[PDB]
Amino acid sequence: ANPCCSNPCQNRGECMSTGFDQYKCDCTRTGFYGENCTTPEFLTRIKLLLKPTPNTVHYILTHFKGVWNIVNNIPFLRSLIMKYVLTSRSYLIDSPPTYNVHYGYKSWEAFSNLSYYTRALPPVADDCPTPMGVKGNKELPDSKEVLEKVLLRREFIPDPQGSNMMFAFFAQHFTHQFFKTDHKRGPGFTRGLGHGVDLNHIYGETLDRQHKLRLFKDGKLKYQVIGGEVYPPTVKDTQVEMIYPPHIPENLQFAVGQEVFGLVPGLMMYATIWLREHQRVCDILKQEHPEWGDEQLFQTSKLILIGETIKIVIEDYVQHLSGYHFKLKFDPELLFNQQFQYQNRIASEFNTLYHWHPLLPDTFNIEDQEYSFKQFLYNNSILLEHGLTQFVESFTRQIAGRVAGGRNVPIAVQAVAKASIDQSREMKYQSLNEYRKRFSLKPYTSFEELTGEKEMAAELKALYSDIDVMELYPALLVEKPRPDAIFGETMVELGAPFSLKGLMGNPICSPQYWKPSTFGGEVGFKIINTASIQSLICNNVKGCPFTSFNVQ
Amino acid sequence: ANPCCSNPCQNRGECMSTGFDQYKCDCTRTGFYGENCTTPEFLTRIKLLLKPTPNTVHYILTHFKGVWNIVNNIPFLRSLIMKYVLTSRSYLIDSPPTYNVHYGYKSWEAFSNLSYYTRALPPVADDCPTPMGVKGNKELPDSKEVLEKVLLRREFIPDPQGSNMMFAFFAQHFTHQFFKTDHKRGPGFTRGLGHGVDLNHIYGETLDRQHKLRLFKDGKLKYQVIGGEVYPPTVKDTQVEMIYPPHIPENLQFAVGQEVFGLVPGLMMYATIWLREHQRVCDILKQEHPEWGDEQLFQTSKLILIGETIKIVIEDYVQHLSGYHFKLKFDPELLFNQQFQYQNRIASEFNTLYHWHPLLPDTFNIEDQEYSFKQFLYNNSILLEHGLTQFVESFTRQIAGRVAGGRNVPIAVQAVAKASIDQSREMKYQSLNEYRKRFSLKPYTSFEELTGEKEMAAELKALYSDIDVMELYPALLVEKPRPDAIFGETMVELGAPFSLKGLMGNPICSPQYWKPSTFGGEVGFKIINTASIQSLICNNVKGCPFTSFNVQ
């Protein structure tokens, strides 16, 4: 009933109800005035003209490999480039944070409550006429239906980018320190109050936990030597609570530091690689500092490891996932002379668009056998029986599924995408078009425009009817992959702003933290400065197995 | 034993131990190089030359009243000035946060743990030779002694600035939302996790508390009408826990929202003025928005009230306390085109230097009687017996004590200043000279230089011996008042940076929040934009009693 229901306020302006039937727009600092923040300010026009389309840039970025190579070799130039991408990307996200599940308005409660996931777009008034506002029907397409018609995988489609198993699992582990829904509270609630890259998944959510995980000696994390290799310690010994099916014989209930990481040997693989990497930096710091004590060694390592993580996530993981030609660089300084908030709050939207279940294949082939989900899930023995070398080897070579494009959701993880559809529903999310407009993208004129193909398009049109009523999660998967890539524009445009904030806006990236001393010396500083997914494995895996986020 | 013990690293560089006996300095971005970050970078020299002394500026600021008057009338100019003060002040504080009670090094634990108070200077190694580092003796001057010789008040010295009772109590109330030590944990620990101007003291620390305080109707806070006036509701009714002596008859156990505010009618006076100011804004918003609901009315008011509080604290409280001639202005935009972190963490140092007990007189004279501490403390009846009009009138006229200068600590609140001395001791604080250097101030060459007089000076010298061993708290009080002012340079230079951060670096000050809509319209926006201590009382006190933070 609320006049704002129809999302009248265009151009990022703010709608406020002003008397039951009438509403008002806060066109403040938008660059547009008038009833709906519709008419641009003259200078706005100037910018609007020059604005190259993301795809144009995308082309230009993905092409000219040689021109690009010159750039990658003129430091002054590269950094110069790195900066641009770094800034532009950020004017898009809200910092400090604004809305959420419950607050369509700004409120202190919203701003202060760290248990919520922030929201990039306000939810929809519970008193509106239709779930997407005013457009659509008393209801939305049946979930189970949308799930089956355009989502579920028939024949495994591989990723045309080469993303292997080392990658898909890395992204699972990585995002799983910040995406940690508090189901007991509801979706929209995170249990990772850190709201960012805090390596909580390695260390424990709380100091109480972290302490049950630490050896308190040379700063080392606790661990055990099975066979001749190092593995996380027993839940039995450390007493840390972990999630494990009753049939697990204990004795294999690995501790780690993120309760759920015991349900997929792909998590635990990495969770043992980083455990291994902790002690490693310890022994390095401890050499360099004969005079340091346990707690300092520890505290400094957790910092370097975060340094590495951000290093690897920008220069390998994102670099790959982008398919850019221009080498992205992790250099905290490009921002040192820019306005930039070193704070971050994970948005449910980011949590949502990151439901990349399509990466999963149908069997997990660890050099010699192929296992089903039913054989992989909650089964350490596999990892203990295969070792990490012949696990890194096997995953380096094993393409993963395309995410965007169409029907590639594993019927196993089907229960999941169904839920994903249902939750965003309950979290009163908004139109996919709205989000497109929000991230300065032009809205799809037809389901057919969204898909690029026509079977699904018309198949969707069957249920959604108006494109301006098509949801966000589905269309993210049921969408037209840009060239031979894994995602479509929408997924690339909503996620990149979200990703470079929680990555760049981290305390260790702030001027007061960015310097040798913070990390234990010039040594530990370069540890961060030379991190790579190849080195992570090299130093920690049995025989410097070659690796990459690409199935060669 | 730690080589860093002697605080070798000058110019804001960072000392790091490098092998038991050797240490190393992180002169990064200091503008100085060499073993102790001692030798300046050429350009550093240039700036160093032009650097006018704080006192020069102080002079220039406090004089030329007519020149200043022209400025206060050329908008473009004033704002221009307001900006400079605004920025310079800030390059001094650490954001994001660094050290604390337990962490002399940066650590994630430090950065993440919101229960700690941040520290502007690291504590001193527990393994150093002397409590101030290496200078001094196995011990420090006896507290009890320092307390008596240069601190305690003999004859009440009034403030040469005019600070009345309205002011002293305002500052108690105000700072008491952010200064809230968790004694159960220890000094250094805050229970105010909000770390800033969150009006928690009006609303309650937790949502569970805020809920016991709210009427849930037109957004209004719960209250009661005694006589013909409005007063906070009973602890009996709301059930909110508050701190009250067993002899209190209940029936007067006012609720309010900050457990301790029930032990001084000066707190509760204001605590009732703001309660009254809440409902007021509600009724305004509820007029303007016939269509709003309880929770929205509520949430918007708490925002406007924070807007008012920041407005009043900058343009009245700070403006007065400064004695400037130039009118300070609260305009969030002066920063809109500056690098500025909209985050904040209260430092124990700020908590310490704010122990302004000297403001207190010896009797509280509420128009007709004079009460002793023993009669004022935990006694509402006074407030209820006198009313707020003849409480505002009585306080507007009743000078408060000078803080800096010498021996003006009430023998009642003596237990306190002793503690203050003992705690900064346990929190392993640093030399007053160190802090002076930290805030770009030249260190005192003699106890004599610190005091400006000679009885105390020589009296201090008796115990401290080296000026480079004199503590922070004492010397803050035992110090030379700049002209006819209440504080000395040290107190003005350490606090102002600390104050404008937590004031300006507030979400409602950030571009996304700074606009009409955030506050319910253009009405609620001007409520913030026209706030004044005169209006706070006018609108909420029985007969628009004239007020000010000055005993006329």
Ligand code: HEM
């Ligand atoms: C290896 C097998 C995997 C299984 C069986 C699995 C299963 C699930 C399940 C049960 C949920 C909860 C969904 C809900 O109830 O809303 C979930 C969430 C999620 N999964 Fe997976 N997943 C797997 C792999 C991955 C991978 C490789 C990624 C990497 C992008 C991924 C990313 C996510 C994300 C982002 C969430 C949301 C996390 C949260 O908010 O708690 N998953 N997955």
Ligand code: HEM
């Ligand atoms: C009106 C009578 C007042 C009384 C009886 C009083 C009493 C006290 C007491 C008992 C403490 C606890 C000290 C300790 O155990 O460490 C204290 C702390 C403090 N007082 Fe007052 N005070 C009064 C007024 C003021 C005023 C006007 C100010 C204004 C600056 C002030 C500022 C402080 C501060 C900053 C603290 C530390 C707060 C904390 O960390 O918990 N006090 N005062």
Ligand SMILES: *[C@@H]1O[C@H](CO)[C@@H](O)[C@H](O)[C@H]1NC(C)=O
């Ligand atoms: C604003 O949008 C409303 C529909 O919500 C429309 O009726 C009105 O004419 C629009 N006005 C302008 C100036 O865009």
Ligand SMILES: *[C@@H]1O[C@H](CO)[C@@H](O)[C@H](O)[C@H]1NC(C)=O
């Ligand atoms: C956050 O807000 C919800 C209600 O608004 C509350 O139930 C939850 O406990 C809050 N969390 C905290 C830490 O206050």
Ligand SMILES: *[C@@H]1O[C@H](CO)[C@@H](O)[C@H](O)[C@H]1NC(C)=O
């Ligand atoms: C788990 O792996 C072990 C060894 O690789 C195997 O014996 C077991 O059958 C697997 N579990 C399932 C459910 O396949």
Ligand SMILES: *[C@@H]1O[C@H](CO)[C@@H](O)[C@H](O)[C@H]1NC(C)=O
């Ligand atoms: C730095 O301080 C050390 C004492 O810790 C002193 O020996 C050395 O000469 C100093 N050097 C400079 C350049 O200040």
Ligand SMILES: *[C@@H]1O[C@H](CO)[C@@H](O)[C@H](O)[C@H]1NC(C)=O
């Ligand atoms: C804060 O940190 C200290 C140790 O670093 C810990 O003992 C205390 O319990 C922590 N508080 C919280 C709320 O984590």
Ligand SMILES: *[C@@H]1O[C@H](CO)[C@@H](O)[C@H](O)[C@H]1NC(C)=O
């Ligand atoms: C409290 O105030 C009343 C009236 O102002 C006074 O009669 C009474 O003695 C006071 N109580 C104490 C303990 O001083």
